[PDB]
Scaffold this active site. Sequence first.
Site, PDB file in Angstrom:
ATOM      1  N   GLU C  60       0.826  -1.203   0.000  1.00 32.00           N
ATOM      2  CA  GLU C  60       0.000   0.000   0.000  1.00 32.00           C
ATOM      3  C   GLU C  60       0.863   1.256   0.000  1.00 32.00           C
ATOM      4  O   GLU C  60       0.516   2.259  -0.634  1.00 32.00           O
ATOM      5  CB  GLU C  60      -0.934  -0.013   1.211  1.00 32.00           C
ATOM      6  CG  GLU C  60      -1.995   1.081   1.210  1.00 32.00           C
ATOM      7  CD  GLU C  60      -2.814   1.095   2.487  1.00 32.00           C
ATOM      8  OE1 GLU C  60      -3.013   0.014   3.082  1.00 32.00           O
ATOM      9  OE2 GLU C  60      -3.251   2.189   2.902  1.00 32.00           O
ATOM     10  N   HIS C  61       1.996   1.220   0.707  1.00 30.97           N
ATOM     11  CA  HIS C  61       2.914   2.352   0.710  1.00 30.97           C
ATOM     12  C   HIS C  61       3.615   2.541  -0.629  1.00 30.97           C
ATOM     13  O   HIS C  61       4.105   3.642  -0.903  1.00 30.97           O
ATOM     14  CB  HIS C  61       3.959   2.176   1.813  1.00 30.97           C
ATOM     15  CG  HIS C  61       3.462   2.533   3.178  1.00 30.97           C
ATOM     16  ND1 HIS C  61       2.376   1.916   3.760  1.00 30.97           N
ATOM     17  CD2 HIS C  61       3.902   3.447   4.075  1.00 30.97           C
ATOM     18  CE1 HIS C  61       2.170   2.434   4.958  1.00 30.97           C
ATOM     19  NE2 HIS C  61       3.080   3.367   5.172  1.00 30.97           N
ATOM     20  N   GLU C 137       4.999   4.789  11.633  1.00 33.88           N
ATOM     21  CA  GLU C 137       3.565   4.577  11.787  1.00 33.88           C
ATOM     22  C   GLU C 137       3.263   3.557  12.877  1.00 33.88           C
ATOM     23  O   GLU C 137       2.249   3.677  13.572  1.00 33.88           O
ATOM     24  CB  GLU C 137       2.954   4.136  10.456  1.00 33.88           C
ATOM     25  CG  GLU C 137       2.921   5.240   9.410  1.00 33.88           C
ATOM     26  CD  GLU C 137       2.375   4.772   8.074  1.00 33.88           C
ATOM     27  OE1 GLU C 137       2.275   3.545   7.866  1.00 33.88           O
ATOM     28  OE2 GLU C 137       2.043   5.635   7.232  1.00 33.88           O
TER      29      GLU C 137
END
Lengths: 34, 34, 446, 105, 425, 55
Positions: C60-61, C137
């Site tokens: 996703e990154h 994160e």
Amino acid sequence: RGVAGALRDLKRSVLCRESLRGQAAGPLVASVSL
Amino acid sequence: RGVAGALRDLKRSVLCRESLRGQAAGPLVASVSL
Amino acid sequence: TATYAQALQSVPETQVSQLDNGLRVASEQSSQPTCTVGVWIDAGSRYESEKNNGAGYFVEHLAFKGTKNRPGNALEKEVESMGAHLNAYSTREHTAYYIKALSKDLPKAVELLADIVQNCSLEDSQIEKERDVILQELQENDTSMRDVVFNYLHATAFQGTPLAQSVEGPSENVRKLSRADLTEYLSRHYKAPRMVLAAAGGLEHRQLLDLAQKHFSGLSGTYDEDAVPTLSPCRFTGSQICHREDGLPLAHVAIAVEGPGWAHPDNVALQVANAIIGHYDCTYGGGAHLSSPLASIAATNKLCQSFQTFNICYADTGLLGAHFVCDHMSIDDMMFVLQGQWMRLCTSATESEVLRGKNLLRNALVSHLDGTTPVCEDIGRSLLTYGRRIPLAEWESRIAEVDARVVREVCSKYFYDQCPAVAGFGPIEQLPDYNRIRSGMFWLRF
Amino acid sequence: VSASSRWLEGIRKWYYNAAGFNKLGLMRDDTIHENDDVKEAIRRLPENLYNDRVFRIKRALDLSMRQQILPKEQWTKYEEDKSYLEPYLKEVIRERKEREEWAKK
Amino acid sequence: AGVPPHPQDLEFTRLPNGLVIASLENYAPASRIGLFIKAGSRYENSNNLGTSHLLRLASSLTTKGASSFKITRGIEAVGGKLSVTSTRENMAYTVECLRDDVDILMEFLLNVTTAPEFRRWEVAALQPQLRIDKAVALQNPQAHVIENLHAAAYRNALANSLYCPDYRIGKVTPVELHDYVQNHFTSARMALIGLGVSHPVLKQVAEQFLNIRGGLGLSGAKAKYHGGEIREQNGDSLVHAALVAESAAIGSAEANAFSVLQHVLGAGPHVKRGSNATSSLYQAVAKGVHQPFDVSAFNASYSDSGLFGFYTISQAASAGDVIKAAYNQVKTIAQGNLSNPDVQAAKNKLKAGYLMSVESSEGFLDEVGSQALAAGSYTPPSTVLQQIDAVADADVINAAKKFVSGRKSMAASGNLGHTPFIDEL
Amino acid sequence: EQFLNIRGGLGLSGAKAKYHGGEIREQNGDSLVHAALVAESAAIGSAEANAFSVL
Ligand SMILES: CCCCCC(=O)OC[C@H](COP(=O)([O-])OCCN)OC(=O)CCCCC
């Protein structure tokens, strides 16, 4: 639920530069409900 | 006793013009003791 | 003049088509000038193993950081320059990438989603950049007690199974995940029979299906190899995890039983029962006069800052229960009132409050499907879970079938005398012992 | 309005002076028994009426200790007995009746 | 085939008493009714500050037609909703329910807005909620910075905070609430907006109940821009700072120029975890700053004034480098360095964002209600895009010039040891 | 000489006070308004300081 909009309990931390984007404001609005 | 000097529990009320004179300041000083 | 029942019939049918490579293409047309389009993939942490856990969250990154035809900034500049918005998310069972844009920008939007899902660059220089970003994160998520306590709940409830794994993965796997691990994850799971191209807004289904043939045709589909993934069942375990930390000012508690899963008809009646218990926050205006006895007592006696019920659904399993946060001396009272309402509904639910739960659900369902992006999500997720779009008129039929007898039977089937999964975090000295919690799942008077 | 309604009022003034709480300076609403409805109504009184109620009860309890009463000039006259608590208590009861009617549905 | 019906038009009507009714029948399963009122915090003065906050919190207190118990239970019974949204100019009482229950929630809405009793004991029990509401709001550092930004910019009437001052919590009286409603909740200050409702019943309701004759006329208490700065030394980890100048009142053509200038500079991202290439403010700061930060153009347009500028979040030591870099980036646009492709991409972000912000009934109702009070009319979206296209490149430049040369207002919070004052910029 | 001979860890600082001017206003519920209006005058010990003391 109460809302505060500006972009147009310890909450959390925002450290990196990716999570910071969108935090800067862009006029306050205060909403209240049941 | 702690002191705050500036002139050179509900405390009280100062209503009349005679009791007001001397209240206006004239440099703060904070003292503390035992 | 139109009634509520008649308005459910006026919603346009969701047109569904399927390419020759297994890619489903679904749309709901409207008169809007904007639209939302995206790809919903049947991938998530539940498919990942312990060695490559967090690989999907890593991808996703990298999905928006460059492609073979649009390297680096090129993708962002195209999206930004046409005023569109590009977003994505990943749960334990579903991954999604969707664009919000004007209706006239439909062909460019679909073209970008194809280039993203198929031709992801995954530059080694970028992987090392996102390595540090995900780690930051992870430190950020540790400060959100809500995210922590729900990861603990999954960790203890589905212990020993893939569902115990969190989406982000452990800090050690993000540090040792190689580019080969990620490409292996993509070729294995990003396969056309496991994806759904969903759209919603002002657009005809023809041009969506044409664009689907135009850009997604070049994707191996309907027979990859003898490497087919299949989700096995996941054992639920009655258990308790307690992270004692008296430095935090408020405790977080999440308690739940095993839910049935996506396709079970019982979810409708369960959501009606959860709507009766409802949810509370210290900013609500109602307070003492609220209908929910838990919310009324929580506001009158100040037993919590908030609580919420939930019915989390996975394939053939789920987490059904509630989560609250409160002062360290209110954890026992809050647990007592909560369990007393599960037992009250299991045994002695009444007809009027059940009608309130049905009305709360009808309002919740229609208020949520307001906008192109909610509807596009409902289309994509439903085609993966239900294999179809369940019309609003059908949800109304299943809601109207619920009555007090259904709630008593359905709640007892999942709550009464069942082992819960408990997760605690913060100043939880007053959190009741598991045996006392387990005893709160039945009544001696009944 | 007629001579007969003055006789009903006549016996009410008789029972009032027979009840004898006017001899201690009290009013009728000072003597009411405090249930949950009455406690809420007292809670809703404005500051002045609350402070007046408190002193009359205090003065009457002081008299009851000494087994004394006030002079007749200071007794509470039947015509001047102010039902200061009844409008508040009527509203508290009306709200409870509404809660009790919603609980039936 | 699967196509939708023919979408109806919005009905719009002005009554001679000043009231504005606007309705749209979208044939949705839900209905939504909003009463928009020119009663925001700007109509407070230095003797009744916070009265509109406590009023915003008192929507479920007892009315003449419905007790507090009935309002709560009556709305929840049908699964409905009652909300109160406030800006510095408007209060908006919104009500939502399934379309078969519009009548019930309409009755509650009118009672809350036109027959509140504000009982002495009910109001007293509600005072501590001001402290809880304000505390939840002010844990976003953006909220207090923008409170102080307005306190610094204006002498009156927009310096007033959206939230009650601490010294006023417990001091707001029921008389002040009655006087606030009588003065501001009047026909010529109101607009009754409805979705999933017919135009006759709203117009019928408007004429039966919303005919409250003005206790206070449309005030000429114009906001007076003054400028200044408020600095809050605290223990936050990052410095928040907003630098602003007076820009333009809403609805004027100059306002559209600032809205385009907002998207030329950058205001909020479009891509999850994106580098924000098309944001000239972000790229300008990223040149000389390699720490984590954020920067965004700020645009706040009101009835008789406006504030345009930018908002920064940075480490305490980089606060001056971020602000000066951003401010210099606005100067280069004021010096003329602005291409035509740059302005067109900004118009696309603006035009696209406006349309997206009215996809939902919540965003559509708020737009129609705000237009009714601000403009006394409804401007359809195609006309709004037409007005955005009419913005010239020179208009965007002159808006940047007005910011650079204008008397500044600044608010900052954090460790301000390296945060410049205005005269140091 | 026995005890107060502590050698300088920080010299006589040249961190000079920089007058800037401005205003801070505190809306509260006091009964009376207190207000001070001031301008930069003079450092102590200078002859100009004695003039302000007479003023
Ligand atoms: C005449 C019969 C009386 C019955 C009372 C009774 O059994 O007490 C409850 C407990 C078990 O129930 P629980 O504690 O799980 O609570 C369940 C809550 N839902 O039982 C015991 O272990 C207590 C020991 C009693 C010794 C005298």
